[PDB]
């Protein structure tokens, strides 16, 4: 239980300035669009795969904005086992930062007990 170092979800989203300013503070508003996803998490082979689909333009996610989302500058995130922590291997991008996801990347997930498991994360993008 405390021994678990699993990836449980691989997701993606795009945050961008909507062009609005907050009604009270004037702060530039960030709209967040979650991408549609399927995962194939294959624990026994140390690989987690996802196919993301960019949702249709709508609201502040205009066609112009939708055109800015690409596999070369994609924000990926994961969920992991309870109380586990994930670290990019040297050269892999951080989760939550726009990054080049045209190639697969490796991560070390550390379980609460300090043991680890290496994961390969590979994603593709559909439009």
Domain ranges of the chain: 1-127
Distance CA 117, CA 97 (A): 22
Q: Is 12 left (phi over 0), alpha (psi -120 to 50) or beta?
A: beta
Other CB atoms closer than 10 Å to residue 80's CB: what's the count?
20
- Relative to beta strand 47-53, strand 116-126 is parallel
So what CATH class is 1-127?
A: mainly beta
**For residue 65, what are the CA distances in angstroms to 11, 60, 62, 69?**
19, 8, 5, 7
Residue pair 74/101 in contact (Cβ under 8 Å)? The answer is yes
Other CB atoms closer than 10 Å to residue 124's CB: what's the count?
12
**What is the end-to-end Cα distance of the chain in Å, rounded?**
39
Distance CA 89, CA 102 (A): 17
Residues making up the chain, counted from first to last: 127
Q: How many CA atoms lie within 13 A of 66 on its CB side?
A: 14
Count Cβ neighbours within 10 Å for each residue of 47-58 and write b for 16 or more, e otherwise: bbbbbbebeeee
Other CB atoms closer than 10 Å to residue 98's CB: what's the count?
16
């Amino acid at each position: 239980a405390y021994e678990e170092a699993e990836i449980t979800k691989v997701g993606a989203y795009h945050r961008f300035y909507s062009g609005d300013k907050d009604a009270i503070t004037g702060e530039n508003i960030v709209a967040e669009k979650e991408l549609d996803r399927t995962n194939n998490i294959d624990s026994e082979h140390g690989v987690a795969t996802a196919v993301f689909t960019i949702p249709a333009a709508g609201g502040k996610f205009t066609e112009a904005e939708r055109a800015k989302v690409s596999l070369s500058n994609l924000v990926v995130y994961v969920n992991v086992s309870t109380a586990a922590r994930v670290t990019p291997l040297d050269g892999s991008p951080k989760f939550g930062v726009p990054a080049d996801w045209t190639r697969e990347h490796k991560y070390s997930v550390m379980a609460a007990d300090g043991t680890k498991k290496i994961w390969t994360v590979k994603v593709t993008l559909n439009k």
